[PDB]
Scaffold this active site. Sequence first.
Site, PDB file in Angstrom:
ATOM      1  N   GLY A 215       0.656  -1.390   0.356  1.00  0.00           N
ATOM      2  CA  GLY A 215      -0.010  -0.425  -0.476  1.00  0.00           C
ATOM      3  C   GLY A 215       0.669   1.061  -0.129  1.00  0.00           C
ATOM      4  O   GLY A 215       0.088   2.397  -0.879  1.00  0.00           O
ATOM      5  N   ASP A 216       2.120   1.113   1.000  1.00  0.00           N
ATOM      6  CA  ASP A 216       2.761   2.381   0.562  1.00  0.00           C
ATOM      7  C   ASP A 216       3.551   2.390  -1.044  1.00  0.00           C
ATOM      8  O   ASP A 216       3.663   3.521  -1.145  1.00  0.00           O
ATOM      9  CB  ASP A 216       3.965   2.380   1.494  1.00  0.00           C
ATOM     10  N   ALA A 217       3.771   1.713  -1.596  1.00  0.00           N
ATOM     11  CA  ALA A 217       3.991   1.910  -2.790  1.00  0.00           C
ATOM     12  C   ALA A 217       2.927   2.095  -4.401  1.00  0.00           C
ATOM     13  O   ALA A 217       3.451   3.373  -4.667  1.00  0.00           O
ATOM     14  CB  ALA A 217       4.946  -0.288  -2.875  1.00  0.00           C
TER      15      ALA A 217
END
Length: 238
Positions: A186-188
């Site tokens: 999700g951060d990516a």
Amino acid sequence: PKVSVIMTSYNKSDYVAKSISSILSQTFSDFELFIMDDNSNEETLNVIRPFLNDNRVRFYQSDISGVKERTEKTRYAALINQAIEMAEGEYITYATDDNIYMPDRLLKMVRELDTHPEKAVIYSASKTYHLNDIVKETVRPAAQVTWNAPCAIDHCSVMHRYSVLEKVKEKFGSYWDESPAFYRIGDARFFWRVNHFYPFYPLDEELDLNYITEFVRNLPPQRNCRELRESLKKLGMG
Ligand SMILES: O=c1ccn([C@@H]2O[C@H](COP(=O)(O)OP(=O)(O)O)[C@@H](O)[C@H]2O)c(=O)[nH]1
Ligand SMILES: [Mg+2]
Ligand SMILES: [Mg+2]
């Protein structure tokens, strides 16, 4: 506050105190700390509890429960979006319940953005200690300006101007991507959206640290890093 620190928490009772403490003792103290707990167990909540007496903490607990609800969205992305909508800081940064900020992290990141009005997203280096004492030490460097952050830069290593969130929402309809196809990275995926408009500028210092010593079956097929990196290379912004 100058800075809004957004931490997500879910059942990591043996780690969350060290995480929260690392933020509360920062040398740059002008921040608000959101603790977005995703309806954790009693033990976690009992570890978090004393920290709510710090007047900078903004504690929010979800009512989420059961596998359908846990897999309907990428939960931390949903909680981060909720905290973004409440944030008052000029600069935004992210924390987790098992990641530690080094003591001058906020000072150094606030100073870099204050000194360089042309930089909108910054990222530092990060270190991970493997314990078995230390058996291994990994560092994710911050050496170059990059238009391709996905899977190269962690969730806990960035700070960005609040104005970055506007462009992103205008193109994509939301800040972080709540789709459960991006649960693992999700951060990516959020960095992928940011990289449509801004490169990430490096701060070459290790300012965050990690120590490593039915849900899964109900998520959809996870999208991966190569897909995100190839779409940004094809997009050719840098
Ligand atoms: O139901 C859940 C599971 C996880 N998380 C949060 O999502 C973040 C990233 O997740 P995790 O640590 O499980 O992933 P990893 O470090 O493997 O990327 C953490 O802040 C967790 O507290 C959450 O809000 N709800
Ligand atoms: Mg983790
Ligand atoms: Mg990760």
